[PDB]
Amino acid sequence: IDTLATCTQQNRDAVYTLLRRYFTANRTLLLQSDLREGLLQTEQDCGQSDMLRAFVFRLQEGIFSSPWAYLALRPEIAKWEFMRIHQEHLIPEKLTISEFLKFKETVVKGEATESVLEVDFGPFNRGFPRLKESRSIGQGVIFLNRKLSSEMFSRIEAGHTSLLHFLGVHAIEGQQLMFSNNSHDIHAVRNQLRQALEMLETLDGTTPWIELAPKMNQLGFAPGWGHNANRVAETMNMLMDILEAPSPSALEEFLACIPMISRLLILSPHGYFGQDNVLGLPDTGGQVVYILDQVRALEKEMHDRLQLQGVQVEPKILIVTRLIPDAGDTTCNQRLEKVSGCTNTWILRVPFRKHNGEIIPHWISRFEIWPHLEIFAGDVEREALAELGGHPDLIIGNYSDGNLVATLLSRRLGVTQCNIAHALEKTKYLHSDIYWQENEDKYHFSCQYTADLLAMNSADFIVTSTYQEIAGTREAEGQYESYQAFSMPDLYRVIHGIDLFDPKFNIVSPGANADIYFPYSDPNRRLHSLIPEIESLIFDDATNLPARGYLQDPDKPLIFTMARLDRIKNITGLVELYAASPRLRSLANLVIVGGKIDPQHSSDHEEQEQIHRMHQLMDEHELDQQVRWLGMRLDKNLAGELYRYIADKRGIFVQPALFEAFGLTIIEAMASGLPTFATRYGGPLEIIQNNRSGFHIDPNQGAATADLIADFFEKNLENPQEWERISQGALDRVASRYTWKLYAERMMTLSRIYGFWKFVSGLEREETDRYLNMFYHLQFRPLANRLAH
Template identity: 55%
Template sequence: MITELKTLFSEHRRTLYLLCQQFYTHEDSPFLLRSDLHQLFDLFIQTEQGQLLKDSAVEELFCSLQEASKNEPWIYLAARSTIGHWNYYRLHSEEIEIDEIDVSEYLEFKERLVGYEAPSDEYLLELDMTPFNREFPKLQEARSIGRGVEFLNRHLSSKLFVEKREGSRKILDFLRVHQHRSTQLMLNGMIEDVPGLQAALRKGVKFLKNCDEDTCWDDVAPTMMSYGFQPGWGRTLEDILEMFHMLMDILEAPDPQNLEKFLGRIPMIFSIVVVSPHGYFGQENVLGLPDTGGQVVYILDQVRALEKEMKEQIYRQGLDIEPSIVVLTRLIPHCGDTSCNQPEEQIAGTSNATIVRVPFRNDQGEVINDWISRFKIWPHLERFSRESERKLLETIGARPDLIIGNYSDGNLVSFLLSRRLRVTQCTIAHALEKAKYLFSGLYWKENPEYNFQTQFTADLVSMNAADFIITSTYQEIAGTEESLGQYESYSSFTMPALYRVINGINIYDPKFNIVSPGADDRVYFPYYDEENRLTELHDELHELIYGDHMEGSRGLLDDKDKPLIFTMARLDKVKNITGLVECYAKSERLREQANLLVVAGSIHVDHSSDAEERYQIETMHRLFDEYQLDGQVRWLGKHLQKNKAGELYRYIADQKGVFVQPALFEAFGLTVIEAMATGLPIFATQYGGPLEIIVDGKSGFHIDPNDNEEMAEKICTFFERAANHPQYWKVISDACITRVEENYTWSLYARRLLTLSRVYGFWKYVSNLEREETRRYLEMFHGLMFRNLASETQ
């Protein structure tokens, strides 16, 4: 493309000079975003001179631009030609010349624009993961991103087929290593080589075919063990035969589907550790506290689903083993009305899943008593991981089989634990802060309260060290054609005076897998399921919404006949609750049609120790006062237990209300799933997970949280249409319920996650998926960069 651009710049100097001058009309910032650039070019192309560039390579370039940096006479451009593929250009606005440059030069120019210029005799560290990934198979098509395990299975099947002798031997060796405590599983020493395995399989099949249909493993165990087989092949005759046949087919001619199905049935996962240090992790009275929200709900539901699925799978494998799951979090002695000061806590709804809490300690080894913001916990994590390791081995009685990290801090701890214990590591970001805050890397020094430099370093270490990464949506990895994904934002960026990231992560890496969570169907079920409704709560819910003033509330609804617009979230900047309140306040039409119910945070500034939440509380009160909202908005600063929250959704659905999720960005959106599952029509942000969850106009509506007028218009239009056509509300409601039932359930999630852990465990064994070179590089980066940054945390 650069050749074509150079020709155009030579032939249309006058036109391109005028175009370049348009960049300098934006004097407020040295940086232009995609929306600015598109607006700039759209206006220019309407001019007589601009018409000359229509359908040209210049127009193609502008369509792909994500960002521009300018300092007259230079203009630097970042173009995203397709998802995950970037090119960088430099324009001279006086000479009218264009050159393609590398990412390092582009980042260096941005650094100069914010006042940093590296001395000529100094070297700024550059992080580049490219050399470590050259020999590793990569996805080629953008549509395949997030389906890494499918790609690996195809690749492995092909490799096993081509290298049949060596591949079969690796499968044999892999089947030999499985045991639980002192019990050998799958194969014993009777089978010495691949021909011996194939002969034993044929002998086993012949024997089993002559057994009764109701035969189980215990009935044939002595004979099977004499052939070389140990427990783990299945409980019933049908399951054992199916496993034997699958393995015979794989040894003869492997195919991806058969391989994944076979690996998914191998007894490998008996104990799991889930890591989530920050916030208040508990089962009661924690939601809405600082740094405590959807992630807690996600993990508790995840653990229940995983235990249920593990039990079913272990039983089917013919084993009598009780699985165990430990949620590792921080112990907080001064934790208010929560259980976060208890060292251990059984998870309700499980038989052997426990919350294990380990304290943070200072340099003298003394326990730190109070909550610490997620932005400030970095100095404590390494010491926390070492104490946690001892506690986990004591609790489980052995090394866990899988460690799942959550958010930046949990992912870093999972890296430290899995490195020492040599255990498969899975990471789940939930939300990467870098994608939430514009230019957060570039201006890291100007935002010391967030400690972005430390968090982004932790993210780079953990995401590259992970054996596999779970995301809830495609967008989380790769964004859309128009916008980059959360993980993609780590592919290249700079933190001036600290280091440049030349290649931080490759979103075409097969470690990425989309596994969407669901809503707890015991709690979030349709409003018309009268048999399971908690109608005993209705008087209390009515009082919460329509009652007189009570502690922790503001606003008394004057007109109780209006339908409700409901929102519920943490009270922070990104969740944008104050943005929704302002949208409602400024729309007379919306205020005439509906009341607004807000369940978020606290109404008292002095009840919060989080600076961001305190500011949002102050903003809420200012909006109430400025727009006189007390008769139309009810604000509850309460933390509702999930059963009560589930019935509240349904109670509002009874009154033909709606749910609005107005976040500036939402990685997934559990509240969106929960509301939809109950049948409450949904309006949710178009930035992040809800864009994929909702089919716009059918199972809900996308809203732009940055455009209050458009948001109000969409909600108003819905209420007007529902008033004129009573069936319309039900059509959308039914579609919401169906969408969740077909795509977002915890049983599907648990089954998929366990399969992934087995497949990647197999890959680590039979290939170089351990990525030893990468691991050593990351250990050095962690030791030399992260530790220093963590020690300087403010």
């Protein structure tokens, strides 16, 4: 399906009529909904044309002026074509991306007095490796291993490649690691390894390193091969194997164990960061929870890896954020703050300053933050360098501000850089680029988008929680995808902004918290002592903390859900699709948690209409004695035991939100063991595999969805066996895919592999560096200096 496919000139009046329908100038820029809408009638006059339907449904946008229509097609994930067609004589003509963007720029902001600067990464990226198939997008590291090992295999030469050198350039706290001297060769190294392996063969496996150490030093080995002798033999045999005939599995496993990761530096400069005073501050969401739940697992794995290799040194993680004097109550005024559940992890707060600074007291929003970032980055470099012994081994950027500071610092210190955007707004606010001048005052998107572009191009690897975050779906463009080509009129045009097939992209999903949410079938950890309390809240009555509706009749199964009550999550729509279809009304009861239940005056916020719609929907249908509505926000421990309590007896969790980005709570539920019916739109699509790990449901189809629920409830004498099929499938799904432990081993390996790639590919990328740096200085710097005006 392409420009050739408008050969739909077989029915010419159809195409002509369609273009006419579009051309009526209401909006000259149409998105999908409009573009598709116009298909139906034409769809009467004249004909049907499944081909034409295919085409139109693949249109991302169009720009109509004059007798000219400029189309952007997206036939398959991450592939775009551009064309323009003449209203009267209808000949599809292929366009370059520059041509199409020039047209959009003209139609929107008018003919130009000066030539636009086109930022183009194409020349810079030409020649570096790319994934080929789009199903593969999001596992870079695999591809990268195969490329690295394939390339490395021509060590039939002086090899190999630089692995022998690379092995020598890491030292932990001044102590040289893996090799006493860098002799290179590889005939030498092969021999030393051979001798060492020989000696080892004659010692007991359990000989500790401190015995091996001096005679290993003679053979040219510094420490870090292992703790005992078995592990030394394992590691060295790995290297022997790679030096003989390198392979991707072997090279990954060996790289993964090099004791090079000691010091982490994580950037999150926006918001009020802090511990547990969170949940609802300005610019603070589960933003905090990702980082906090991660660093615990991270620190553990760091320690385990180093331990196994016999390096005794204690790892350190610094979460750097802003020191705000003006907190006054929350910890945000506190420079060093130790993190819970962690030995050497510390929050390090740093002040914003003026050029003379001058500590700059009050909180600043993320949209205003840009002018402070370079100064902040200098300051952070100083303080973080001082709190660690020296350079960090890895720098992890968070959101757009964190990624930018990561960029600056990482170029300054020469450190492997990982970016985590968590989200990129350019796609969520459609047309915020072409219309950027509209939004500069509130949103400040010129600064933020430029920062974005700079950073996704500067990173060594890029972590994302979902595939969709990167390349989207067949339907929707993905978040990074949005940056491949775009226009900022009066600023610049970007083409080749990001290569979705670059190996830098890795999906590493979060998971857990496994101390709170875990399976109902766990022998040890369940909190039995809250179970009486759980049953109070559910099956008993009245109002003391918000309620009510007193099911009684509870021999029946249970349908459970919990969320912030508001419109994305669509609780109201759940209670609603439960209202009609008396089949599942009679088949099961319904529990709801999260809510307010009488907003009062004074205070609340936002929706509150969700409350009115809830009480209203519950008054109608006679929903009490069926549905228990609880308006507490609960508690971690409590929530966890509750999920587990819904399993036994064989209950289910249903969240029909409209769209969920990642969907943490789906994971929490699944981790609990209970079968989950989740949104079809966003993360849950990837998280649950339908009728193995759980079930997909359409929110807007809830009428029909209600009858999927009842069907699961029937299923072999009131659903004993299949419920357990889904339960175990869910458990297995979480265990195999979404857990902070896997996350952390993956992350710890990635830093190693990508540090090596950086080590090899480093020189070749220097032109890219100069280009990014010239952009930062001559484009970003002024944009952030236009703030503060």
